[PDB]
Amino acid sequence: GHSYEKYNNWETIEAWTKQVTSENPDLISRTAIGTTFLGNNIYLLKVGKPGPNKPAIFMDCGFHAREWISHAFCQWFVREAVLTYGYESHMTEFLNKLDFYVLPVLNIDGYIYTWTKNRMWRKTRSTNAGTTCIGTDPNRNFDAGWCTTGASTDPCDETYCGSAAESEKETKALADFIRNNLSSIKAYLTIHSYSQMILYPYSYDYKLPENNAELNNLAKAAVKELATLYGTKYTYGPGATTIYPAAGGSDDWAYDQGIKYSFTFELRDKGRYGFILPESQIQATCEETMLAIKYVTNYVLGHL
Template sequence: MHLLKIGRRTGSTKPAIFMDCGIHAREWISPAFCQWFINKAVSTYGTDSQMTSLLDTMDIFVLPVFNIDGYEHTWKIDRMWRKTRSRRNGSPCVGADPNRNFDAGWCTLGASSNPCSDTYCGASVESEIEVRNVADFIRKNKSVIKAYLTIHSYSQLLLFPYSYKYDLAADHNELLQVAEGAAETLRSLYGTRYTSGPGATTIYPAAGGSDDWAYDLGVKYSYTFELRDTGRYGFLLPESQIQPTCEETMLAVKYIAAHVLKNLV
């Protein structure tokens, strides 16, 4: 798993944002965005004042493809594959849903204990090596990680905790305000409309998700993006929409990053 760290070297520890893409294999627009983000962050440093200020002050950890084996499987064999590609003794079914495998209400609401299900929670918490690697890294660096962004598709939503329960997060009002501001900024480019809110009530209950886990760990600004579209193309978003989707999503990410930057503790 390749993790990139983007930021200006200062010789001292900086606060950071962690962003991952491609947790679900078939959501191709997600890894496309992480690649876009990496290129723009590096190539516009020094010319884009907002990006320059961000990278001067913070580091951004980017995991371009979370579910590597699943992603490869969608390119070679089954375009609509979602899960990891792990195997279990005694089961003919392959893989688990990495976004049901984190230690956040694990295997309760909106997750399945059936190994053949697309929302299979896994044999145990962090049973999937991809999940364990990410969780270990964030735990190890939680003193500097101030925001967690995970990029999915589709539905045009900007979600935040909680998904594994209906209770509102302690920081609900601020998280909602930031999400709505980010969605408004995103809409300013091409008119794409996003809905913001807690995962459980905005889309559906789902236990074991990475944003809930990160939030409960202490990463206050934890958000899940569900990128274009709302169902016309779904996971098969046409190539012509890659660039506009990335451009508008970049605005939202920069908006959240700017808020995090202003509210560093």
């Protein structure tokens, strides 16, 4: 029951990860990097033409449960990759030279909850000692100035930073995977909505990354490219000053691991629909986003 221009439930996305892999074994392999709190499988698709010691770009979607256009984008990206390989020169070179590690849904338990109970759920669905309140904000759960700012220590809050960095099985799983593959991973891209922004470090502090000028120029070029298609306007800059300070984010953590190209994407829109982006905008949203992602990929490849 899968469609690329509709939002798909987890059962459908899971079946899709199996199907798309089965149908494109020369471009995709599927693994599970762990289980969620509620025992769902955290799938990771390695997209690329297999070969020895290839560099890689890591991209995840679905950190936050209600940001459905994020999940949709990872699925869209994988189809574009497999459909255009061999026909579009850039994507062909991309997949020949590197792998994309695509994690289509990180926070699966929360995503399921937005389908079954509460469309505006954000956090994970793990239990918390001493309270009935459920869930941790996965993007406050990383070891990046953990919980020192822009985060709550209260499990009942939407930005609960957890009992400790990587207290969540899902964030632990992602961090473990990236740690185990640091040599290969050259960029980290994490997909969110909404706001139409590209953000780079830092968010947990007002300090700037050493390659700040490069990141600004890269984000500037990526947003220009994105705008070429439908005129969609993005802003960009360091997380802390571009949107708000917040510790424990994965982009900041990834960067401090040594991944020099680390970006948070905030997709459409600017609040007219917010998280409830109509399915009628999935195609255009994903198409323009593809251009920005491919631009960044092309740049990273030329800087290996």
